[PDB]
């Protein structure tokens, strides 16, 4: 392929993972699409809870789709495990956070921010952001300048 830009974090506890998600949500825009990958127990739900908190959402954060409009931006959290018409959400005006998105690769927009959470060694996690498209390179650049 061509080159992709990435950010990579290491987190040693779920609060650090939530903090990264909170930072990311602060700079999301309509209609961003974030895919969220990682093995069972890696921390995708944990990430998603922190993302919702970063949008100012105060409730749950699986039912294929679930929607939140109480924040600064609507959040369409999806868990496509297992296996349409998702296109209205992807081109909506909120943020789509798509867990296990690779199970519906054929339906995804070409551009997205791919988030992968991997277990590394101890109880630790490595979270990689991969920008696919100029919008998501700009998002990652904003996150890097505002690294708390
Ligand atoms: N650095 C970390 N980031 C996220 N979760 C962590 C971390 N370290 C330990 N955990 C624990 O791993 C589990 C992740 O659960 P969950 O987010 O539901 O995983 P998934 O949604 O990927 O199946 C939780 O018990 C969480 O507290
Ligand atoms: Mg999950």
PDB file of C-alpha atoms and ligand atoms in Angstrom:
ATOM      1  CA  UNK A   1       0.000   0.000   0.000  1.00  0.00           C
ATOM      2  CA  UNK A   2       0.910   3.648   0.336  1.00  0.00           C
ATOM      3  CA  UNK A   3       2.116   4.986   3.687  1.00  0.00           C
ATOM      4  CA  UNK A   4      -0.343   5.633   6.531  1.00  0.00           C
ATOM      5  CA  UNK A   5       0.170   7.969   9.476  1.00  0.00           C
ATOM      6  CA  UNK A   6      -0.372   6.581  12.942  1.00  0.00           C
ATOM      7  CA  UNK A   7      -0.375   7.494  16.587  1.00  0.00           C
ATOM      8  CA  UNK A   8       0.461   4.871  19.181  1.00  0.00           C
ATOM      9  CA  UNK A   9      -0.105   4.934  22.928  1.00  0.00           C
ATOM     10  CA  UNK A  10       0.732   2.575  25.712  1.00  0.00           C
ATOM     11  CA  UNK A  11      -1.732   2.355  28.601  1.00  0.00           C
ATOM     12  CA  UNK A  12      -1.249   0.510  31.876  1.00  0.00           C
ATOM     13  CA  UNK A  13      -4.803   0.840  33.222  1.00  0.00           C
ATOM     14  CA  UNK A  14      -8.358   1.412  31.940  1.00  0.00           C
ATOM     15  CA  UNK A  15      -8.382   5.036  33.087  1.00  0.00           C
ATOM     16  CA  UNK A  16      -5.481   5.849  30.736  1.00  0.00           C
ATOM     17  CA  UNK A  17      -7.388   4.172  27.897  1.00  0.00           C
ATOM     18  CA  UNK A  18     -10.494   6.241  28.697  1.00  0.00           C
ATOM     19  CA  UNK A  19      -8.405   9.423  28.768  1.00  0.00           C
ATOM     20  CA  UNK A  20      -7.197   8.802  25.215  1.00  0.00           C
ATOM     21  CA  UNK A  21     -10.761   8.198  24.101  1.00  0.00           C
ATOM     22  CA  UNK A  22     -11.826  11.418  25.841  1.00  0.00           C
ATOM     23  CA  UNK A  23      -9.136  13.382  24.008  1.00  0.00           C
ATOM     24  CA  UNK A  24     -10.229  11.878  20.676  1.00  0.00           C
ATOM     25  CA  UNK A  25     -13.909  12.668  21.220  1.00  0.00           C
ATOM     26  CA  UNK A  26     -13.058  16.286  21.990  1.00  0.00           C
ATOM     27  CA  UNK A  27     -11.889  16.722  18.380  1.00  0.00           C
ATOM     28  CA  UNK A  28     -14.368  14.514  16.530  1.00  0.00           C
ATOM     29  CA  UNK A  29     -16.627  16.091  13.903  1.00  0.00           C
ATOM     30  CA  UNK A  30     -19.726  15.241  11.887  1.00  0.00           C
ATOM     31  CA  UNK A  31     -19.667  12.652  10.399  1.00  0.00           C
ATOM     32  CA  UNK A  32     -16.520  10.933  11.573  1.00  0.00           C
ATOM     33  CA  UNK A  33     -16.270   7.153  11.358  1.00  0.00           C
ATOM     34  CA  UNK A  34     -13.988   5.348  13.805  1.00  0.00           C
ATOM     35  CA  UNK A  35     -13.443   1.609  13.665  1.00  0.00           C
ATOM     36  CA  UNK A  36     -12.512  -0.166  16.884  1.00  0.00           C
ATOM     37  CA  UNK A  37     -10.685  -3.513  16.794  1.00  0.00           C
ATOM     38  CA  UNK A  38      -9.068  -5.795  19.315  1.00  0.00           C
ATOM     39  CA  UNK A  39      -9.452  -9.195  20.877  1.00  0.00           C
ATOM     40  CA  UNK A  40     -12.091 -10.034  23.449  1.00  0.00           C
ATOM     41  CA  UNK A  41     -11.191  -8.207  26.641  1.00  0.00           C
ATOM     42  CA  UNK A  42      -8.655  -5.863  25.020  1.00  0.00           C
ATOM     43  CA  UNK A  43     -10.597  -2.733  26.015  1.00  0.00           C
ATOM     44  CA  UNK A  44     -12.984  -1.643  23.262  1.00  0.00           C
ATOM     45  CA  UNK A  45     -15.938  -1.143  25.606  1.00  0.00           C
ATOM     46  CA  UNK A  46     -13.650   0.721  28.003  1.00  0.00           C
ATOM     47  CA  UNK A  47     -12.480   2.949  25.158  1.00  0.00           C
ATOM     48  CA  UNK A  48     -16.066   3.544  24.084  1.00  0.00           C
ATOM     49  CA  UNK A  49     -17.140   4.557  27.594  1.00  0.00           C
ATOM     50  CA  UNK A  50     -14.378   7.165  27.654  1.00  0.00           C
ATOM     51  CA  UNK A  51     -15.295   8.379  24.189  1.00  0.00           C
ATOM     52  CA  UNK A  52     -18.925   8.942  25.220  1.00  0.00           C
ATOM     53  CA  UNK A  53     -17.750  10.765  28.348  1.00  0.00           C
ATOM     54  CA  UNK A  54     -15.635  12.983  26.065  1.00  0.00           C
ATOM     55  CA  UNK A  55     -18.794  13.953  24.187  1.00  0.00           C
ATOM     56  CA  UNK A  56     -20.463  14.825  27.495  1.00  0.00           C
ATOM     57  CA  UNK A  57     -22.722  11.745  27.503  1.00  0.00           C
ATOM     58  CA  UNK A  58     -23.826  10.655  30.990  1.00  0.00           C
ATOM     59  CA  UNK A  59     -25.708   7.358  30.546  1.00  0.00           C
ATOM     60  CA  UNK A  60     -24.795   3.833  29.384  1.00  0.00           C
ATOM     61  CA  UNK A  61     -21.804   3.446  27.027  1.00  0.00           C
ATOM     62  CA  UNK A  62     -23.867  -3.454  21.403  1.00  0.00           C
ATOM     63  CA  UNK A  63     -27.484  -3.876  20.404  1.00  0.00           C
ATOM     64  CA  UNK A  64     -26.036  -3.938  16.900  1.00  0.00           C
ATOM     65  CA  UNK A  65     -26.464  -0.136  17.044  1.00  0.00           C
ATOM     66  CA  UNK A  66     -27.087   2.239  19.917  1.00  0.00           C
ATOM     67  CA  UNK A  67     -27.526   5.963  19.704  1.00  0.00           C
ATOM     68  CA  UNK A  68     -26.796   8.850  22.056  1.00  0.00           C
ATOM     69  CA  UNK A  69     -27.917  12.410  21.362  1.00  0.00           C
ATOM     70  CA  UNK A  70     -27.366  13.962  24.801  1.00  0.00           C
ATOM     71  CA  UNK A  71     -23.777  15.032  24.037  1.00  0.00           C
ATOM     72  CA  UNK A  72     -22.107  17.657  21.873  1.00  0.00           C
ATOM     73  CA  UNK A  73     -22.438  15.293  18.891  1.00  0.00           C
ATOM     74  CA  UNK A  74     -24.658  12.239  18.328  1.00  0.00           C
ATOM     75  CA  UNK A  75     -22.827   8.959  18.931  1.00  0.00           C
ATOM     76  CA  UNK A  76     -23.695   5.827  16.961  1.00  0.00           C
ATOM     77  CA  UNK A  77     -21.860   3.006  18.691  1.00  0.00           C
ATOM     78  CA  UNK A  78     -22.031  -0.239  16.737  1.00  0.00           C
ATOM     79  CA  UNK A  79     -20.994  -3.776  17.597  1.00  0.00           C
ATOM     80  CA  UNK A  80     -21.160  -5.725  14.354  1.00  0.00           C
ATOM     81  CA  UNK A  81     -20.356  -9.022  16.058  1.00  0.00           C
ATOM     82  CA  UNK A  82     -21.925 -10.801  14.444  1.00  0.00           C
ATOM     83  CA  UNK A  83     -21.814 -11.125  11.558  1.00  0.00           C
ATOM     84  CA  UNK A  84     -27.510  -2.071   6.690  1.00  0.00           C
ATOM     85  CA  UNK A  85     -28.547   0.496   5.945  1.00  0.00           C
ATOM     86  CA  UNK A  86     -25.551   1.696   7.931  1.00  0.00           C
ATOM     87  CA  UNK A  87     -24.811   4.193   5.170  1.00  0.00           C
ATOM     88  CA  UNK A  88     -27.178   6.761   6.683  1.00  0.00           C
ATOM     89  CA  UNK A  89     -25.203   6.637   9.942  1.00  0.00           C
ATOM     90  CA  UNK A  90     -21.757   6.758   8.302  1.00  0.00           C
ATOM     91  CA  UNK A  91     -22.911   9.868   6.407  1.00  0.00           C
ATOM     92  CA  UNK A  92     -24.902  11.222   9.327  1.00  0.00           C
ATOM     93  CA  UNK A  93     -23.822  14.209  11.395  1.00  0.00           C
ATOM     94  CA  UNK A  94     -22.553  12.435  14.516  1.00  0.00           C
ATOM     95  CA  UNK A  95     -19.672  10.031  15.193  1.00  0.00           C
ATOM     96  CA  UNK A  96     -19.824   6.340  14.331  1.00  0.00           C
ATOM     97  CA  UNK A  97     -17.759   4.068  16.576  1.00  0.00           C
ATOM     98  CA  UNK A  98     -17.824   0.660  14.917  1.00  0.00           C
ATOM     99  CA  UNK A  99     -16.590  -2.301  16.981  1.00  0.00           C
ATOM    100  CA  UNK A 100     -15.386  -5.344  15.009  1.00  0.00           C
ATOM    101  CA  UNK A 101     -15.826  -3.265  11.841  1.00  0.00           C
ATOM    102  CA  UNK A 102     -13.660  -5.666   9.827  1.00  0.00           C
ATOM    103  CA  UNK A 103     -16.657  -8.022   9.793  1.00  0.00           C
ATOM    104  CA  UNK A 104     -18.433  -5.537   7.480  1.00  0.00           C
ATOM    105  CA  UNK A 105     -15.403  -4.107   5.662  1.00  0.00           C
ATOM    106  CA  UNK A 106     -17.377  -4.157   2.405  1.00  0.00           C
ATOM    107  CA  UNK A 107     -19.866  -1.647   3.880  1.00  0.00           C
ATOM    108  CA  UNK A 108     -17.435   0.818   5.450  1.00  0.00           C
ATOM    109  CA  UNK A 109     -16.495   4.174   3.929  1.00  0.00           C
ATOM    110  CA  UNK A 110     -13.007   4.111   2.460  1.00  0.00           C
ATOM    111  CA  UNK A 111     -11.832   6.822   4.850  1.00  0.00           C
ATOM    112  CA  UNK A 112     -11.917   6.257   8.600  1.00  0.00           C
ATOM    113  CA  UNK A 113      -9.827   6.363  11.753  1.00  0.00           C
ATOM    114  CA  UNK A 114      -8.889   2.784  12.578  1.00  0.00           C
ATOM    115  CA  UNK A 115      -8.290   2.159  16.286  1.00  0.00           C
ATOM    116  CA  UNK A 116      -6.674  -1.138  17.321  1.00  0.00           C
ATOM    117  CA  UNK A 117      -6.215  -2.123  20.972  1.00  0.00           C
ATOM    118  CA  UNK A 118      -3.637  -4.883  21.519  1.00  0.00           C
ATOM    119  CA  UNK A 119      -2.519  -6.597  24.722  1.00  0.00           C
ATOM    120  CA  UNK A 120       1.228  -6.148  25.312  1.00  0.00           C
ATOM    121  CA  UNK A 121       3.218  -8.165  27.832  1.00  0.00           C
ATOM    122  CA  UNK A 122       2.062  -7.295  31.353  1.00  0.00           C
ATOM    123  CA  UNK A 123      -1.524  -6.212  31.856  1.00  0.00           C
ATOM    124  CA  UNK A 124      -0.675  -3.451  29.393  1.00  0.00           C
ATOM    125  CA  UNK A 125      -2.355  -2.319  26.179  1.00  0.00           C
ATOM    126  CA  UNK A 126      -1.059  -0.691  23.025  1.00  0.00           C
ATOM    127  CA  UNK A 127      -3.610   1.442  21.207  1.00  0.00           C
ATOM    128  CA  UNK A 128      -2.799   2.333  17.581  1.00  0.00           C
ATOM    129  CA  UNK A 129      -4.646   5.016  15.619  1.00  0.00           C
ATOM    130  CA  UNK A 130      -4.346   4.637  11.834  1.00  0.00           C
ATOM    131  CA  UNK A 131      -5.487   7.578   9.715  1.00  0.00           C
ATOM    132  CA  UNK A 132      -7.145   6.525   6.445  1.00  0.00           C
ATOM    133  CA  UNK A 133      -7.962   9.782   4.646  1.00  0.00           C
ATOM    134  CA  UNK A 134      -6.902  13.402   5.023  1.00  0.00           C
ATOM    135  CA  UNK A 135      -9.658  14.159   7.550  1.00  0.00           C
ATOM    136  CA  UNK A 136      -8.231  11.583   9.924  1.00  0.00           C
ATOM    137  CA  UNK A 137      -4.635  12.735   9.415  1.00  0.00           C
ATOM    138  CA  UNK A 138      -5.856  16.177  10.484  1.00  0.00           C
ATOM    139  CA  UNK A 139      -7.632  14.648  13.499  1.00  0.00           C
ATOM    140  CA  UNK A 140      -4.467  12.840  14.573  1.00  0.00           C
ATOM    141  CA  UNK A 141      -2.414  16.010  14.152  1.00  0.00           C
ATOM    142  CA  UNK A 142      -4.836  17.886  16.407  1.00  0.00           C
ATOM    143  CA  UNK A 143      -4.651  15.106  18.998  1.00  0.00           C
ATOM    144  CA  UNK A 144      -0.856  15.262  18.972  1.00  0.00           C
ATOM    145  CA  UNK A 145      -0.730  19.017  19.611  1.00  0.00           C
ATOM    146  CA  UNK A 146      -3.234  18.699  22.487  1.00  0.00           C
ATOM    147  CA  UNK A 147      -1.508  15.691  24.116  1.00  0.00           C
ATOM    148  CA  UNK A 148      -2.466  16.398  27.739  1.00  0.00           C
TER     149      UNK A 148
HETATM  150  N1  LIG B   1      -5.007  -0.526  29.825  1.00  0.00           N
HETATM  151  C1  LIG B   1      -6.281  -0.993  29.758  1.00  0.00           C
HETATM  152  N2  LIG B   1      -7.207  -0.479  28.916  1.00  0.00           N
HETATM  153  C2  LIG B   1      -8.472  -0.944  28.858  1.00  0.00           C
HETATM  154  N3  LIG B   1      -8.931  -1.960  29.630  1.00  0.00           N
HETATM  155  C3  LIG B   1      -8.104  -2.551  30.529  1.00  0.00           C
HETATM  156  C4  LIG B   1      -6.710  -2.093  30.633  1.00  0.00           C
HETATM  157  N4  LIG B   1      -6.096  -2.832  31.567  1.00  0.00           N
HETATM  158  C5  LIG B   1      -7.022  -3.705  32.035  1.00  0.00           C
HETATM  159  N5  LIG B   1      -8.210  -3.541  31.412  1.00  0.00           N
HETATM  160  C6  LIG B   1      -9.422  -4.359  31.687  1.00  0.00           C
HETATM  161  O1  LIG B   1      -9.712  -5.155  30.532  1.00  0.00           O
HETATM  162  C7  LIG B   1     -11.122  -5.256  30.358  1.00  0.00           C
HETATM  163  C8  LIG B   1     -11.537  -4.630  29.033  1.00  0.00           C
HETATM  164  O2  LIG B   1     -12.927  -4.899  28.926  1.00  0.00           O
HETATM  165  P1  LIG B   1     -13.744  -4.405  27.654  1.00  0.00           P
HETATM  166  O3  LIG B   1     -13.419  -2.945  27.390  1.00  0.00           O
HETATM  167  O4  LIG B   1     -15.165  -4.771  27.935  1.00  0.00           O
HETATM  168  O5  LIG B   1     -13.089  -5.285  26.463  1.00  0.00           O
HETATM  169  P2  LIG B   1     -13.703  -5.512  24.986  1.00  0.00           P
HETATM  170  O6  LIG B   1     -14.840  -4.516  24.882  1.00  0.00           O
HETATM  171  O7  LIG B   1     -12.500  -5.233  24.117  1.00  0.00           O
HETATM  172  O8  LIG B   1     -14.128  -6.974  25.008  1.00  0.00           O
HETATM  173  C9  LIG B   1     -11.743  -4.517  31.527  1.00  0.00           C
HETATM  174  O9  LIG B   1     -11.859  -5.460  32.586  1.00  0.00           O
HETATM  175  C10 LIG B   1     -10.659  -3.510  31.862  1.00  0.00           C
HETATM  176  O10 LIG B   1     -10.717  -2.988  33.190  1.00  0.00           O
HETATM  177 MG1  LIG B   2     -16.824  -4.857  23.270  1.00  0.00          MG
END
